[PDB]
Structure formats: C-alpha cells, structure tokens
Paper text:
[name] (SA) is the most significant transport protein of vertebrates; it constitutes up to 60% of all plasma proteins. SA consists of three loose domains, that are almost structurally identical and mostly helical. The whole structure is maintained by 17 disulfide bridges, which ensure durability of the overall protein fold and simultaneously allow its flexibility.
In OSA-DIC, the crystal structure binding diclofenac molecule induced changes in the conformation of amino acids side chains in the surroundings and, as a consequence, slightly shifted two helices in the Ib subdomain. All changes in the Ib domain in the OSA-DIC complex are primarily caused by a large movement of the Trp134 side chain, which caused conformational changes of Tyr160, Asn161, and Met184. In the OSA-DIC complex, the carboxyl group of diclofenac interacts directly with the hydroxyl group of Ser488. In OSA-DIC, the ligand Cl4 chlorine atom interacts with its own carboxyl group and additionally creates weak halogen bonds with ND1 of His397, and carbonyl oxygen of Gly401. The carboxyl group of this ligand creates a hydrogen bond through a water molecule with the NE2 nitrogen of His145 and the guanidine moiety of Arg185. In the OSA-DIC complex, the carboxyl group of DIC5 does not create any strong contacts, only the chlorine atoms interact with the NZ nitrogen of Lys211 by electrostatic forces. In OSA-DIC, a unique diclofenac binding site for DIC6 is observed in the large space between the first and the third domains, located above the place where these domains are approaching each other. The Cl4 chlorine atom interacts with the main chain peptide oxygen of Leu454 and Cl2 interacts via two halogen bonds with the carbonyl oxygen of Glu186 and the side chain amine group of Lys435.
Numbering used by the authors: 1 to 583
Write the structure that this text describes.
Amino acid sequence: DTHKSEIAHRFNDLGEENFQGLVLIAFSQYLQQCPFDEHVKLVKELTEFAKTCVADESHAGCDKSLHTLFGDELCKVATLRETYGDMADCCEKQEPERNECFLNHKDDSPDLPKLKPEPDTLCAEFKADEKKFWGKYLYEVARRHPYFYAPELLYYANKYNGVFQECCQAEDKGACLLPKIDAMREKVLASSARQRLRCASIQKFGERALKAWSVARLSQKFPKADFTDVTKIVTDLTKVHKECCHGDLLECADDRADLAKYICDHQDALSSKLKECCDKPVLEKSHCIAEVDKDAVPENLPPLTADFAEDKEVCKNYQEAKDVFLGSFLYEYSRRHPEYAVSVLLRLAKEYEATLEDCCAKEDPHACYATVFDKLKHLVDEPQNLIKKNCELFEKHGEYGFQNALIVRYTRKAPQVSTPTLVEISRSLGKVGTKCCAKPESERMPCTEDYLSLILNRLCVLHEKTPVSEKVTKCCTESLVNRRPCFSDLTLDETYVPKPFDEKFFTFHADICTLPDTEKQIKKQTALVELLKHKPKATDEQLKTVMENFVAFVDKCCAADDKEGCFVLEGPKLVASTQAALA
Ligand SMILES: O=C(O)Cc1ccccc1Nc1c(Cl)cccc1Cl
Ligand SMILES: O=C(O)Cc1ccccc1Nc1c(Cl)cccc1Cl
Ligand SMILES: O=C(O)Cc1ccccc1Nc1c(Cl)cccc1Cl
Ligand SMILES: O=C(O)Cc1ccccc1Nc1c(Cl)cccc1Cl
Ligand SMILES: O=C(O)Cc1ccccc1Nc1c(Cl)cccc1Cl
Ligand SMILES: O=C(O)Cc1ccccc1Nc1c(Cl)cccc1Cl
Ligand code: NA
Ligand code: NA
Ligand code: NA
Ligand code: NA
Ligand code: NA
C-alpha cells in the first residue's frame, strides 16, 4: 500500500533517537559549515513534523517525499547563498535534480579545525549532557566526512559515548581516553574512505561496478551460500549503499535494518559466523554482520577447472548468458579463495572474460581455453611479488622511512599533484605497511589491496575536483578494477616541467622546534616533495644528503640560545648547500 506518509513510516521504523541522529547527519553532510545548534533546530522541526504525521498520516504535507521535505528545509536556510554560494542555485530545481545538485556541492576536504581531544573538557561536556555530546560527535564527523555511511556513524557514536562512560570515572581520564580516541579515529577514517569508494564507484562506474565488488566480497565471507543467495543479498546491500550515497539516509538505515534481519533469518544458509551478530540490538547487529570473518570454505567444492576450462561446452554456456556466466565465475572463484584480494578476483574475472571472447571465435576453442588458469595466474603472482617487496621495504625503513620512500615514488609519478595531497597520500600508504605487513599470509593480499583501493580512491576524489595530471586522470577514470596496477605502472612523469626551488619550504621560524612529532614529520615530508618538484631526476643519494643536512640544520637551530636568530641568519646556508647537493 502506497497511501503512506514516508516521514511517519521512517519515524515508526527507526525510533525517535535514530531518526534524529540520521536527520542530523543529513544536515551536517549537506551543510558542512553550519553550526551544530542551527542543525539541531532543523532536526527538531522535522522531528515535530514527523510526530504530527505519525499521529495523523492524512495531515497536510505528510505525503511529501522525505527527501523533498529535507530539501525544503535546506532551501529555507537564510545563510545558504552567503555560505555555500551557488549551491543555493540548486533550490531552482525539481527532484531528483535538486538533490543531485546538492550532492555535487558536498566538500571532500572542507579543511575544518583539527579536533584535539581535551579529556577534562570532554568529560565535563559528557557528564553535563550525554545526548548533546552524542549529537556533537555525529555533527563533527559527518561534516568532515560528508559521505560517511550514516547508520555506521550511529553505531560509532554509541561506542564513543561508551568510551566516555568508562573513562570519565577514571582518575587519569587522559590515559584511559586518548588511546581509545586514537583507535576510534583510525576505524572511522577507514570507514569513511570505504563508503567514499562505494559512492565514487556507483557515481563514476555504475551500480554494476559496486555489485561486482560486493559479489566477490560476499562470496568470500559466505562461501557456503548459493549464487542466488549472494546475488539477492548483494542487490539489497547495493540499494542500501546507493541510498546512503544519495543522501536518502532514513531509507538507507531502514533498508539496512531489513537486510540485517533477512541475513539473520537466513543465517543457516549463509554462515555459522553470523550467530554472534544476530542476537545483538540493530545497529550493533549490522555492524557485526559487516565485519564478520570469512566462513570456512566447505569441503568438496569441485575444482574450478571443471566448469570453466575442462568442460567441452564453456563457449556455448558462456554465449547463452555471458553476464550470468561471468557473475557465476566470479562467485565460484571468490568462495574458494579467501586469501585473494577482491580486486585480484575482479581482475581474474575480467581476464577470464577476455580469454573467452578471444578463444570462442577460433576454430578449436577448447584447446585455447583449456589452459586459461595458466594464463590467469600472473594476476595472482604480480601482487604477491609486490606485497613481498613493499613489506620488505617497510620492515627495512620503519613506517616513517617507508612514508618517505613513498613520497619519492609518488611525487615522481604525479609531480603536478599539490604538495599537501602528495604528503597525505604517501603518509596513508606508508601506514598500510603498519596495518598489513605483519598479518597472516592469507590476509596480506586482501589487506594491502583493500587499503590501497581506499587511499587511491581518496587521491582520485581529490584529483577529480582539481585535475592537474593526465596520468592520474587516466588511472582514476579508466577502470576501477585496474586502478591500483595502473598506479603501480606509472614511472617518472616525462611530460613534467620542473619549478624553481621553492625555498620557503626550507626556511623556518623558532616555533618549528616545539611542533608535535607528526607535524615535524609533515614539515620534512613537504620539503622532500618540493625537492623532487624542483629536481624530478635527483638521485636517492642527493635526496638523502639534502634531507640529512635539513634535519641537522633544524636540530642545530633548535638547540641554539637564540633559535629564531639562528634560523634567520644561518638559514641561507642550508638553502645554498641544498642547491649545491642537487647541482
Ligand atoms: O534536546 C536534548 O534533550 C539534548 C540536546 C541538547 C543540545 C542539542 C541537541 C540535543 N538533542 C538533539 C541531538 Cl543531540 C541531536 C538531534 C536532535 C536533538 Cl533534539
Ligand atoms: O578525529 C577525527 O578527525 C574524527 C574522529 C573520529 C573518531 C573519534 C574521534 C574523532 N574526532 C574527535 C576528537 Cl579527536 C575529539 C573529540 C571529538 C571527536 Cl569527533
Ligand atoms: O588520514 C587522513 O587525514 C586522510 C584521510 C582523509 C579522509 C578519509 C580517510 C583518510 N585516511 C585513510 C584512508 Cl584514505 C584510508 C584508510 C585509512 C585512512 Cl586513516
Ligand atoms: O547481473 C549483474 O549485472 C550483476 C549482479 C550482481 C549481483 C546481483 C545481481 C546482479 N545482477 C542484477 C542487476 Cl546488475 C540488477 C538487477 C538485478 C540483478 Cl540479479
Ligand atoms: O604500491 C604498489 O605499487 C605495490 C603494491 C601492490 C599491491 C598492494 C600493495 C602494494 N604496495 C604497498 C604494500 Cl604491499 C604495503 C604498504 C604500502 C604499499 Cl604502497
Ligand atoms: O633518512 C634520513 O635520515 C634522511 C631523511 C630525512 C627526512 C626525510 C627523508 C629522509 N631520507 C629519505 C629520503 Cl630523502 C628519500 C627516501 C627515503 C628516505 Cl628515509
Ligand atoms: Na549456486
Ligand atoms: Na527502499
Ligand atoms: Na584483468
Ligand atoms: Na612500478
Ligand atoms: Na618557511
């Protein structure tokens, strides 16, 4: 029955608290530069209207689309044009174009103040008003991460409240809190980047691209499931993801809850690992299901060669329904190989497709396709060889030195990219060494390829907004499945014209001496990028000499009596020695 008030329905389904949270998240993601207490006022107006429609669904306006109602609140914001410029032009449109226009203005790098955890203040805020404290967390994250997957953010906010519940009772609040914040922050940044990649997949490559990624991932998690159980779940899951990517946050959350319930009702057909998820309350249940471990591969699965290489009829089977035959290939390959990266499984399925396209046209197709697994294996061997070599490099240098080796590599590949992005991306890539290299053998390929696909996606999302390198545009737009190898294959960009030495990056005031370590690292890594932008062909030894003099010089002026005097008067010596080392 379609005679439904949508707002009433979502309020009925989700409950007041989650409804309010999701509405607050929607406003914070679309209007990232509005204060908390202004969005709270809008949430409260829409909650009062929802409750009116719950009481009486025939009440005037209860029949508007939820998204239409929300858009209307946006366009009634007095400071819309003033703060968001021509985002206010979006107000002239009809749905769904109005919404697509709003989504166009979400800012991926709003460069908002860095949140410093002050444990004494936060514990006071928390004790003062817990709900406010909860909403302030949803607002601060959502406005920094405007594609953050909204129901997961509700889950993280409950865990964030739990952290303060335990830690505020301690004597040293700081010692309890800070390691937990740190843990949270890494999990929330990864989560943001994961959902950002799902949104950019849908938008730039079609919803079929995301479906293929999810078929591969779900078949590895739930290897006893039938192909059509996987395609049903992937279909519902992709609709949830797309709804969240399109800002339909109440519908995304409501659908997600229905999917969690479906998976728990069918847990016998899917995975034994689901049992611990399925008695949890709804947000925790869903989270637990998304993070579930790969079930054990069943015994007795026939070898892949039986259907895909050995069988006489591969071409006939393929030609009858090419898409279904390849989806089934992907599913069969993925359930069998939890130790492969999902992107490697997609690359395997693409190459299997190209082989059949080629072989099935020949006189004797079977002699040509019988050996396809030998043609495929280089797609497993190449990433395995890269992972071994990059994890060695990581163990040789440590995380910071590995970040610096990545700075050199990426600035050579993409020297037109702005310095702060080269630094951010190289720092994130270096942390993949920390996150993955010490893992069990069967987890290293999924771990490193997954993180690379998140971080290269972040580069692609930034570069889409201000494209400066043709080679980045090619790697970012050509094919999602080959994005990571496309970047690995970039060498020194030969079209790049060097800039003059940008000496501000090698000149400091005394306040450098008391920067926290992360910030000192960033100052040094920024200089390193700038070296390469001035001298793209500089040798690793030249770079090392320079950077060694650099740290020697900062060390010396930091230990001076008159620090600023040293930096200012001795500074040009560093700048001349740097130009000599590079000559
Ligand atoms: O209103 C309350 O009881 C707690 C409170 C205090 C300050 C600001 C907001 C809120 N609640 C609140 C929150 Cl935290 C999020 C969305 C909507 C509302 Cl009404
Ligand atoms: O730190 C970020 O950039 C976002 C983030 C994610 C998870 C947990 C905490 C934070 N930031 C954060 C901090 Cl560092 C302090 C107080 C309140 C918040 Cl939301
Ligand atoms: O760490 C940063 O500030 C860069 C950044 C911005 C937005 C979202 C994620 C990230 N970093 C990041 C990424 Cl892109 C992937 C996995 C894990 C992390 Cl911490
Ligand atoms: O068939 C595809 O294009 C990929 C795919 C993957 C998982 C689940 C379903 C599908 N196909 C599919 C699609 Cl793309 C749209 C609507 C319904 C279905 Cl069954
Ligand atoms: O980065 C590359 O080109 C090689 C490669 C391929 C697949 C997966 C990871 C990696 N490299 C990689 C690894 Cl294996 C660990 C930490 C950081 C990086 Cl950049
Ligand atoms: O290794 C050092 O002590 C010199 C130094 C200081 C700051 C930043 C980088 C470097 N060295 C460095 C360089 Cl210049 C390039 C690739 C890898 C490394 Cl570890
Ligand atoms: Na099946
Ligand atoms: Na729906
Ligand atoms: Na391929
Ligand atoms: Na390479
Ligand atoms: Na300077």
